[PDB]
Symmetry: C2
Subunit: 231 residues, 2 copies
């Protein structure tokens, strides 16, 4: 029976893993999880409460984007030759990981996690869980950090054929995952960032992206260009 | 000849100590260069714009930043230096569990406890008012301290239910936990009478040769708790 991915639509890490699974042709059951609920069965799988979580028949839960992405390289990626999303060379592997961590950890802390919490999770949450109106001060701080991250992405995109070098990698998927969440929310001004825009257009047009562009969060309407391959 | 690598680190950084432990276990000699995680110096931020520690620069001159990237790199390249003493398994599920525990101690515990506590107790003393300095924030201390027990209890559970934290042999998981615990223990923040099972496990890690530089180490302007270096505490 197919494995299960516990995830949330507005989790970049979750989107990143979905991308790797589609690129590599896996079939997966998606199970939407709300970590703030502290669901006991979910915490038994992953006591850290983080997303996503990949579980096959063995019931051995693989916890988080990094662990899952490494596992998928070890058990599939090594076969893929030209289509391998993590290289063989240790320095190239290090660069692909550096970019994955930039977008899923650094930009996530600076911008995406707090912004998603204020704008998405705080709608879905009950008052007791921390639900309520968005905090304007957190929104300011997160937003003030965006323009510098978009400037870096533009630079990477303009200077190499893909973010890590000469082929598509986990680095591109991780950036695209994160950008897709911010873009859903209309938080990116693309008029600033023409080089990043060209790069994002290429990612968002891949078949693996289609389920992300079709996806909708209830009570939050995406920005009008969100699903557009020409935006 | 091959110049020895440099590790940019801070003594009160668990991720830094974790890397040091790997390097010692595998017989590397390394030049240690102390950096302040808070200071934002322009040359350090050129090397690592993320401002994270540690940063490993071997004679390739390619900067490898953070505990995960460095530890994976060391598994991949250590060759004869890891023979018969490998700290990251071959099996994908065992590797996944070693990683999961490394992330627990160096990311989850770091956010819940160690990073805010170190900042209030170490860094806010060393910092000037303009840099963000002042008296420790009592509310941040309280929150961070209140999160310690859950982590110690998880560690006790792991240690009491398996021979090493990830399973049947010593791994990065043990080294990461020990690194995080050693920082807290330097500061006297662990009540060992409340965590006996974890105490037995830590006594095994702290007695390894690789730990000797950590126990000898001192942080500028902070005296460790009296039992810090004691193998028989």
């Amino acid at each position: 029976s197919m494995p299960t991915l516990y995830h949330h639509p507005m989790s970049p890490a979750s989107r990143f893993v979905r991308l790797i699974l589609s690129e590599y042709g896996y079939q997966t059951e998606l199970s939407e999880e709300q970590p703030w609920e502290n669901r006991r069965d979910f915490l038994t799988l992953n006591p850290a409460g983080t997303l996503p979580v990949y579980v096959d028949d063995s019931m051995r839960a693989l916890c988080g984007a990094t662990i899952i992405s490494e596992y998928l390289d070890e058990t599939s990626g090594i076969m893929k030759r030209d289509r391998r999303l993590l290289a063989e060379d240790p320095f190239q592997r290090a660069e692909i990981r550096r970019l994955t961590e930039w977008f899923l950890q650094k930009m996530e802390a600076d911008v995406t996690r707090p912004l998603v919490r204020e704008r998405i999770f705080k709608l879905q949450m009950t008052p007791d869980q921390g639900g309520g109106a968005p905090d304007s001060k957190i929104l300011r701080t997160s937003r003030s950090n965006i323009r510098q991250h978009m400037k870096y992405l533009s630079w990477l995109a303009g200077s190499r054929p893909w973010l890590a070098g000469d082929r598509i990698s986990y680095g591109d998927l991780a950036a695209a995952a994160a950008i897709s969440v911010l873009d859903y929310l209309g938080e990116i001004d693309w008029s600033d960032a023409p080089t990043a825009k060209e790069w994002y257009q290429r990612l968002k047009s891949r078949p693996s992206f289609r389920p992300l562009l079709a996806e909708r969060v209830r009570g939050v309407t995406p920005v009008s260009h969100y699903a557009d391959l020409d935006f």
